[PDB]
Amino acid sequence: GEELFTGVVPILIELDGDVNGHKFFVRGEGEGDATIGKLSLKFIATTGKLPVPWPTLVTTLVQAFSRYPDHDFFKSAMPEGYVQERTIYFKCDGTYKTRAEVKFEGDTLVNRIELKGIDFKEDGNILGHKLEYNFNSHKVYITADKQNNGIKANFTIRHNVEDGSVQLADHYQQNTPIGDGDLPDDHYLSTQTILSKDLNEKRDHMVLLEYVTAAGI
Amino acid sequence: GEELFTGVVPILIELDGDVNGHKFFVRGEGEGDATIGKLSLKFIATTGKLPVPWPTLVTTLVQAFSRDHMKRHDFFKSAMPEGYVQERTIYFKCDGTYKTRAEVKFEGDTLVNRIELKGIDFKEDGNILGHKLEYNFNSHKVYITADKQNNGIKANFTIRHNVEDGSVQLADHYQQNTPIGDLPDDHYLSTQTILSKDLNEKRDHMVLLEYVTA
Questions:
Q1: H or E segment at A56?
Q2: A16: which strand partners?
Q3: What is the distance between the alpha carbons of residues B87 and B100, in angstroms, rounded to a whole number?
């Protein structure tokens, strides 16, 4: 299981989404190296202009590539993979329900996701496209969910807003393996991300670079 | 126009408001002194109990009474006596919105503010319709910048409304002012307000004291 990540691994991410009746599809190609814990990805909105701003999609688009010094549920579940479901509540605004399957298809790692968006405001921060094009790092506390034989998590993302205010997204997360199963003691995952664009790509896109680690306490 | 404000000026304010299909009327009588920049006003809800808490109406219910070196920047006294139109859109965070239009001009010796207010999307059992806001108003600086296209003042600012449980209700104001007849560099207006009641008034009312200085 852990053996799979001892080198650069190719990554494919597919997102099929419906938000407030807006359908969009996002496809991503990239590499991930677990040893350094590095993600490099490029995302394309195949459907045309994204109905939602890119930073909101960042959390839902492979924590299996985290770098552990001296418990890795995500890598252990491989290659059968794990299922990740989230309910993301946007403060004073709509909500995301997502389900994803993260697993190996051949030599590459595939993330297949379905996202449904409800109750969003026309001319809210989300549908108004009022969020700043960046993502700010926070530690994520992970707990063992014995009932699902999986990890549970709760955290809030702070999205910067063009006017200078902040849009809060409250995340509830569950991950469970697909085959026959090892739950890790409490730990933090720290993800740091940079968002940029390719100058030669005419399509609506996001270039994402990530460093993912883990800690105790 | 500045000439009119050299003495105490009588003030009449009329508000026509519809919030969530609740219709109400507010009439205000008072005096204003531009020299000290002081407003004294009393407001009565003729229609009966107000559907919304009084502090939400404070912003909507005359900046021409601002108080010096920046006198050239005084857009409001300028447009006078023909007057100016003030339009606002106030969004209450996690809650409804006010869209307002007003005309501020001189009718005879008195200064008149006549306003139309429409309120939409408010929650029953929200701070606004629930009447959960504290009866006070807290000073805020307001950043004012010119607007060449409109020949007028635009401004944006946020009000913090105290909430009985100890939370805060945020109201973000977007403002545009345009003259009616035939501009100021960036500056802010600071207003301090006191809300009180006349003990002898059985009607729903607000007694308002204000100082504006720029």
A1: helix A54-57
A2: A25, A114
A3: 5
Q: Is B93 an 8 Å CB contact of chain A? A: yes
CA distances, A201 to each of A13, A29, A44, A198, B41 (Å): 18, 14, 9, 6, 61
Q: Is A23 on the interface with B (CB under 8 A)?
A: no
Q: Are B25 and B45 in contact (CB under 8 A)?
A: yes
Here the tokens at position A69 are: 């010094």
Specify whether the CB–CB gap between B63 and B76 falls below 8 A.
yes
* Main-chain dihedrals φ then ψ at residue B96, nearest 5 degrees: -65, -170
Question: Would you mind telling me the total number of residues written for chain B in this entry?
Answer: 214
Which residues on chain A are in Cβ contact (under 8 Å) with B93?
92
Report how many domains make up chain B: 1
Residue written as token pair 């559907």: B51
DSSP assignments along A74-108, one per residue: HHHTTTT-EEEEEEEEETTS-EEEEEEEEEEETTE
Residues of B in Cβ contact (< 8 Å) with A167? none
| Domain, as residue range, for B74 | 1-214
CB atoms within 10 A of CB A52: 23
For residues B15 and B183, what is the distance between their CA atoms, to the nearest angstrom? 28
Please choose, from the candidates B88, B92, B137, the residue with its C-alpha nearest in 3D space to the C-alpha of residue B113: B88
- Structure tokens, B52: 């919304």
Exposure of A179 by Cβ count < 10 A (0-12 exposed, 13-18 middle, 19+ buried)? Answer: exposed
Quote the CA–CA distance of B115 and B11 in Å, as a whole number: 14
Instruction: Report residue A2: phi and psi, to 5°.
Output: -65, -25
The experimental method behind these coordinates is X-ray
From B94's Cα to the closest Cα of chain A, the distance in A is 5
For A127, the token pair is 């549908």
Residues A185 and A172: beta-carbon distance below 8 Å? no
Question: CATH number of the domain that B125 lies in?
Answer: 2.40.155.10
Nearest CA in chain B to A123: B91
DSSP conformation letters of A164-194: S-EEEEEEEEEEEESS---PPPSEEEEEEEE
Q: For residues A155 and A172, what is the distance between their CA atoms, to the nearest angstrom?
A: 7
Residues A143 and A186 sit within 8 Å (Cβ to Cβ): yes
Give the DSSP letter of residue B138. -
Structure tokens at A158: 């702070």
Q: Give the H or E element holding residue A154.
A: strand A150-160
- Chain B residues with beta carbon closer than 8 angstroms to that of A92: 93-94
CA atoms of B13 and B96, how far apart (whole Å): 24
Taking the C-alpha atoms of residue A81 and residue A110, their distance in angstroms, rounded to an integer, is 9
